[PDB]
Symmetry: D2
Subunit: 293 residues, 4 copies
């Protein structure tokens, strides 16, 4: 199985993408053993980005690696189509979209039509990113089969029965979990891996959990999984999307600028408090030889 | 109380706002007794519109009426602030935002900061548009009290207890419901009225329900309400946001073009089947002398 | 519209129904203007009562008034049938049942069969008590119409659209709300009234809210409604079903014994704390001349 | 890990526990490799049974095996305490309770007191049976830690994160899942196994999934799992608790009488249609040499 990072988008003080910080972060992630980078996901604040910003992110990350899944979706299908088509000039893994968000009670016919439209125009394999809490809709194993053109799916949901069902109904589809707390479990149960937001700040931990599980060292894999779970819980105190920036600076040693408001940056005191919540975990990970002293 | 229309945004086949059609619609609504127009709401596909497009919408409607609440929110706070500031040049009722949508588990402090920032820059009264199913978060009466700066709230939720709590905790706040099926009830229980999506296509019905409820003619109000409910249910068959275009054409008699995909337009067969579903209701409404 | 009390079942220290405290409470409620008494409801801990206890409660309340809706439901249909049939010798308003509880994913056919069975054997009008949070199922306006034998429905749900739908689809059915916070609203919108748990301890307030609303004094009705709402909120601090006993003793001036564990009684300190939460409301209600000084 | 059967309670036409049929079932289950039997669970209609009937059940099963977890909970704490105490005379694995059901919004303190009271009187290890959809409340890993006295937990919830949290916060607790569709996964991820309702009718399949998962033959485990999933889905068509009777008769070849109404038995036509649905699955299982 694979660990895929939904890579953070660093912003400058003046609310523009910091392309050079992004390239530092991407190179570090690939060097630490991350399989692929998912660009313009939730964690990268993709719904907060304009189409031109989504393209700028692709271009910046592509200067580092071609192992990229390029998220292109949004509420203007013409923009999503234009991005999908532009990707023809890049040697990437695939394009991706979440379901159309905000609007409740969308018909199944319209949801299917949306995804089939993107598959129609895509010069690359297409990945479904299912996130019912964020979008308000579920594109389950049955609907995914009906659509019929997906290479893979990332399922962000704690219900692993729903995730397994993709494999059951679509045996040749790649099936990933969006649940960081399930890296060990996903590896152990024959799924294809995780799109792990926490791999931005602890790529070492996330790849090691998977490795331990695949080496049949389940107890060791779970001990590490439970430490990673504590970091995730700490990130939720001040807001995980904002906290992710602080956690990456802390564990990885380079600055990632700011998020984009309404995803507000942590202030100096909140940053100090968050670091106090995780520094003992850092010490433990140094002691396990997972992180360099 | 009031009826406020979350006005539909008509689009061209090539996905541009059709300003001509929008003005025809706005003029008819005001003519038929609608109190105010809420621009760039869910029903107007506000989340599908860029900041310039939200401004384009305000401009077209402002050519017709100043009775406007202008929704400016989005996932880029700088854009929302810019729209708030540009509204200074428009003699309107207020501005509004939904909560930041998509992102789950946003901190209460961050949600409060988002709305307080908008209040700090606004040249007009600010309205909260609360829609937990759409946005993934609830800015309830307690959070609204903490924010402290709202002139009014529209609450799109089934739970009228939740709506009444805004009045209980914030007694000088204007409090509206977003549930079209509660026009009669909301008007009878001392709240300020409804932002009624169904008032796009049946402004006559929604205004009459309000009037009857104000007169305490609750039995007559409910009979009409229950008919409006049946048209709402019919609109859900193929998708309400799309069906609203077809129903406005059918009942009001002018075309409103297309929605914006992935809000796909109904096809010919769907339109035919929807009309079949509400044909009888129209007949009853003409009999009751509500429609011509 | 009517105010109906889901009457509390008082228990002795040795976990038996205190029949004499029950009769004191029932007489007070009828004297304060309560229209009918719903016996063996949630508030009376009906699901915690044996069939013989359910019968003992009917008999005790019947010594005071015949204005009773007799709840008979449970997970043994033979017991529910036996109780329904026994009611033939009593001049009561009707029998009632909640949906079968605990078991999730019950078929619509089986739910309909349950209620039609009770209607088949009932010597009295039958009332549906719909409480989706407590039972796990919804018997909505459509299913109620399908069943076709209900005289009335109590809908415990904050969604008043669902409650109105009973009237819409079943125009001749009596339709009550189970939401105490909606007494004013229910009265004002043409519904038939409320089964109000808070009328155990403040029957005066609940009947006055309804009266004010029907006198077209909506602002005055809402001011009182909002005070009642504060008492309900206070009752939830220590657990409303347990707190109800303390609140009735406090406002009405007689003891109601104990609830039945796992509905544990408040201890002396919790009782002291709860009274401190509501005593200012009591003072306000005395000042409004709703409660006697 | 283990497979534990929440054993079906067979009833007569006149609504009495059929003790003879129950013993035939228990003997077959143990014979086919089931590790323990959980008596008076949801699947055995435990909430529909009086305290004496729960005791009747324990007695019949105890005639066959002592590998029993005995569920004693209900809405009368004195009855539950009495059952806990009477279990002293039975050499069993443990006792168990669900959370008090029906009543919404029970205080955390009251929930904790309920379980601690049972622990204080129990002559055996105590197991938490966590089933939020059924009971209306969640006794999660944090509440279980606060209670402090559980030997094990069965968690009936979709969310395996929630189940793994019991191990994380309570590392010496036995932790089981109640989701039959997760037998393969639970066995592979270091948890203690499943209390599997489908092991009533296909004990061979559930025990084989466990074995294959233990051998790390995950692809083979999942193929079998996915077939068990299809039989679970078929059982939902007419209602799982009722369908379980018919499926046990079909696959295991003895009659289990009736459920207790309002858990109504399937009629002849329903049984025929259910059999049609799982006939093909049986054929595949015989081919795989899992069934005769």
């Amino acid at each position: 199985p694979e660990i895929i990072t939904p890579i953070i988008t660093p912003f400058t003080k003046d609310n523009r993408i910091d392309k050079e910080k992004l390239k530092i972060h991407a190179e570090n992630l690939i060097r630490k053993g991350i399989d692929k980078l998912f660009v313009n996901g939730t964690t990268g604040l993709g719904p907060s980005l304009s189409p031109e910003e989504k393209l700028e992110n692709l271009k910046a990350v592509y200067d580092v690696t071609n192992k990229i899944i390029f998220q292109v979706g949004g509420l203007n299908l013409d923009d999503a189509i234009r991005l999908a088509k532009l990707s023809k000039d890049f040697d990437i893994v695939g394009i991706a979209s979440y379901a159309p968000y905000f609007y409740p009670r969308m018909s199944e016919k319209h949801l299917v039509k949306y995804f089939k439209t993107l598959c129609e125009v895509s010069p690359h394999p297409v990945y479904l990113f299912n996130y019912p809490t964020a979008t308000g809709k579920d594109i389950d194993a049955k609907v995914a089969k009906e659509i019929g053109c997906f290479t893979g799916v990332k399922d962000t949901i704690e219900n692993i029965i729903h995730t397994l069902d993709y494999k059951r109904l679509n045996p040749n589809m790649l099936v990933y979990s969006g649940s960081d707390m399930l890296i060990a479990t996903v590896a152990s149960t024959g799924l294809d891996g995780n799109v792990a937001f926490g791999s931005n700040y602890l790529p070492e931990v996330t790849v090691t959990i998977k490795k331990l599980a695949m080496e049949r060292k389940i107890d060791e894999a779970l001990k590490l999984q439970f430490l990673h779970d504590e970091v995730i819980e700490a990130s939720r105190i001040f807001g995980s999307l904002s906290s992710n920036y602080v956690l990456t600076k802390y564990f990885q040693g380079y600055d990632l600028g700011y998020p984009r408001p309404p995803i507000f940056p942590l202030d100096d005191e909140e940053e100090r408090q968050l670091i106090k919540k995780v520094e003992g975990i850092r010490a433990k990970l140094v002691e396990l030889k997972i992180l360099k002293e």
